[PDB]
């Protein structure tokens, strides 16, 4: 069956299988989750330490695509870094032309359309990355968006990507994020990541966290290490 070879093609039953094959790419990735609460959005990533040789604070999967928005990625890291460059360019162009910080919904739509361009044409493959975007602005509020390799974009109160998406999603589902505040949400994100991590298959992980919210005055930033250590100790204690 030559239908799956290219994305220009359609299956006889109406399915573009290259895109689904690209969606299978992110499942290879280690998990990443983002949770939205009243104050803001918290992101977390389970960054597996492949070797002791690799420096800490390397292979970062949490990027800052503008001062007021952050990006968390799962799937091919090369494609993800390129998509982050695209998103940064889109945000800068929006600021330059329209004179203010890009709305997250619009940014998600533009990067999603850029992604969707690739599924159509035969010359170029779909992206191999699924990524989450999150921002807080006093006008818009807390917003969390996820973009699949297809270019589908939606807003999620809580979201997970990667290998352990389903388990992470049920754990997130039993949380009541809407009432909660960010400084608790960091602890619960750590708990969920420690739960879904598989010690047997994955040797070790270093929890990589970020948030955006009013506590930052609407700037996405990496967690202060004291708060990281507190959340990690809480997660280890709860794990039992």
């Amino acid at each position: 069956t030559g239908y799956d070879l290219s994305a220009s093609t359609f299956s006889p039953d109406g399915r573009v299988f290259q895109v689904e094959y690209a969606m299978k790419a992110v499942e290879n990735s280690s998990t990443a989750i983002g949770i939205r609460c009243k104050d803001g959005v918290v992101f977390g990533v389970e960054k597996l330490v492949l070797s002791k040789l690799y420096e800490e604070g390397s292979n970062k999967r949490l990027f800052n695509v503008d001062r007021h928005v952050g990006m968390a990625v799962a799937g091919l890291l090369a494609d993800a870094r390129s998509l982050a460059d695209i998103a940064r360019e889109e945000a800068s162009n929006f600021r330059s032309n329209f004179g203010y910080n890009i709305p997250l919904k619009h940014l998600a739509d533009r990067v999603a359309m850029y992604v969707h361009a690739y599924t159509l044409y035969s010359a170029v493959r779909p992206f191999g990355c699924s990524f989450m975007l999150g921002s807080y602005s006093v006008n818009d509020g807390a917003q969390l968006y996820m973009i699949d390799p297809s270019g589908v974009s939606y807003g999620y109160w809580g979201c997970a990507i990667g290998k352990a998406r389903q388990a992470a999603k049920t754990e997130i589902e039993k949380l009541q994020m809407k009432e909660m505040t960010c400084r608790d949400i960091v602890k619960e994100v750590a708990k969920i990541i420690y739960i879904v991590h598989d010690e047997v298959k994955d040797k070790a992980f270093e929890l990589e966290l970020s948030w955006v919210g009013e506590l930052t005055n609407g700037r996405h930033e990496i967690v202060p290490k004291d708060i990281r250590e507190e959340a990690e100790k809480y997660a280890k204690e709860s794990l039992k």
């Binding site: 030559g2 239908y3 994305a7 220009s8 093609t9 359609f10 299956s11 006889p12 039953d13 109406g14 399915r15 573009v16 919904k105 739509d109 999603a112 359309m113 992604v115 969707h116 599924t119 159509l120 044409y121 035969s122 010359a123 968006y145 297809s150 270019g151 589908v152 974009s153 939606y154 807003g155 999620y156 109160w157 809580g158 979201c159 999603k169 997130i172 589902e173």
Partner: protein
Amino acid sequence: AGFDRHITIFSPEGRLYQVEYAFKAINQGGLTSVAVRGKDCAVIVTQKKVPDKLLDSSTVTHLFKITENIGCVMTGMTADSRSQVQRARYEAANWKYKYGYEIPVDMLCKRIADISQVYTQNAEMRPLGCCMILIGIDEEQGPQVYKCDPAGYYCGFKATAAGVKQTESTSFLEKKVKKKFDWTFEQTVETAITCLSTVLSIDFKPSEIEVGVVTVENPKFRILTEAEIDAHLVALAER
């Protein structure tokens, strides 16, 4: 065979099977949309299915506003739908810029459909696997309903459906127009909801459906609130 797998090549029977597969891609989504016209109003209804609780229900929508007085409902791939929606908005604004008046619904449908034609004739790109249904009010012609498909066919309609239950829904609607007495706004909305609910067997609740309307009194496309949808739904059950 090999006569499929490329849009350009014709079959020995001259059928271009790839676009026909794009038509199947619409039904792969598992959602249905219905549009029915009235004497003074046009409505679009479609299923709203939220797979996960975590998804923000506000963000997920298949109803989009091409311009202030035109609304559309897309059925098929979500990404291709959003792209075609963006192209439609650009075409409408560019029409207003060049010609000084709001684009007619028929001309918008024609522009989008001939774009779909350039897709189905050039090799490298694929037809967008989505279907559009546009509703608006034209002062000369009254309400209008139109549909684009991946092939480039753009015919106007009294009432239509798209998605998995299209044949059942058009069978239902065909009976209703045949027993034509009229359709006021309430009867129009009721006909749409009854068609969708009957073909799906759903017996909907307000969250499960999203409805958008245009009316000669208020030409702007508006997406009714859950309260308005429940008001219409309860009226259906009572009678």
